């Protein structure tokens, strides 16, 4: 009975910026998903297709754990069929998503006096992201007809902006750590059942 390494994902010391969101593949273990639901640690625990009640009763081929950091007001964007700077340019969930979205306030860890500007988010993109697409480009965004040549100025902007969490930011502007559990099901044998 190898137990799924959920402690690696939820209790990691550093979380990734949303534009460079971290994915952790989970396989060949048994996950007691209930232990997470019954925690009172999480401000958000919403499941789609699956039901969060009564779900360590299933077997999946592979489980993906996507972790990143966003502000409180943007957690509503991590859901099927949403739009906005996070859903369009940083992390996009498919319309037919089946999984669970879990978030909790991390202002005690991800805020610092003078501001914590290590957490970034993508600002510009000519096209919306596809589901589960990950864009790590930092090339200067060309907002006009003049090419930018990797130098910023008018109509040539850096695509990433920093959040800047501080301990007395409003709860909407406070950092939240998010973990998206995606359950894939195939022809292939299931490797993670979690009785």
């Amino acid at each position: 009975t190898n137990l799924c390494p959920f402690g690696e994902v939820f209790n990691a010391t550093r979380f990734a910026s949303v534009y460079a969101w971290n994915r952790k593949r989970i396989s060949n273990c048994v996950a007691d998903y209930s232990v997470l639901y019954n925690s009172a640690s999480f401000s958000t625990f919403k499941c789609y297709g699956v039901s969060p009640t009564k779900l360590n009763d299933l077997c999946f081929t592979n489980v993906y754990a996507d972790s990143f950091v966003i502000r409180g007001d943007e957690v509503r964007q991590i859901a099927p069929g949403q739009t906005g700077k996070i859903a369009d340019y940083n992390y996009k969930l498919p319309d037919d998503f089946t999984g669970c979205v879990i978030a909790w306030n991390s202002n005690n860890l991800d805020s610092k006096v003078g501001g914590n500007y290590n957490y970034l988010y993508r600002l510009f993109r000519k096209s919306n992201l596809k589901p589960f697409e990950r864009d790590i480009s930092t090339e200067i965004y060309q907002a006009g007809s003049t090419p930018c040549n990797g130098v910023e100025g008018f109509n040539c902007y850096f695509p990433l902006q920093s959040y800047g969490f501080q301990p007395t930011n409003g709860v909407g502007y406070q950092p939240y750590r998010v973990v998206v559990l995606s359950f894939e099901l195939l022809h292939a044998p299931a490797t993670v059942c979690g009785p």
Partner: antibody
Amino acid sequence: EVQLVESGGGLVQPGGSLRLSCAASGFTVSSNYMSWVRQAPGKGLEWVSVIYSGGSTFYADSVKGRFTISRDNSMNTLFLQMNSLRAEDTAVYYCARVLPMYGDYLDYWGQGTLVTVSS
Amino acid sequence: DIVMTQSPSSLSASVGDRVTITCRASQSISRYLNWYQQKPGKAPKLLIYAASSLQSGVPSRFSGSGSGTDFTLTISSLQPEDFATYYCQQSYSTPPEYTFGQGTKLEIKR
């Protein structure tokens, strides 16, 4: 330079429809955040709608379901399709270029066109 | 929602005076605030963004300050051309709200 020139404003009866146009020069409409902001006679500014670079659109609660923001890549022009217009919609309508750093701020505005909704 | 209240709404000052306009938000908006200057019968021109940063091409006498719920627009020494209606705008909400103030009408006193 940057220039935004607006058109389409005029007189419409209650319940009618009218489509504004904003021809832009100095940037690519299909690459920037664009917003419309209206000013009723004598009153303050009121944001009505915004379109992102990726294409997602957002509206004020006063104009949702009735107004629609659009744009054309080939002629570099933003549009606002206003339907079910009311007397309160009477305002001067501006098109502006949005820069998405540090929240949003509008660094270039058009000169504006007048829309009058009266019987 | 969020409501931006300006103070004062009407204000008069002589050429050379220092001018100060106040904005306040119903919630903390840490520094996602801009200032616009709109002269009669013309389009609004942006003055300050990010609550402190002067827009390119604006005189140095326009200054921005404040963060949280209270912000301040300042004109070091008023110029005859500076009579206008100044608005503060919030860009802190997700999804957008783009809340404005009611405006502060500034007249030149002589």
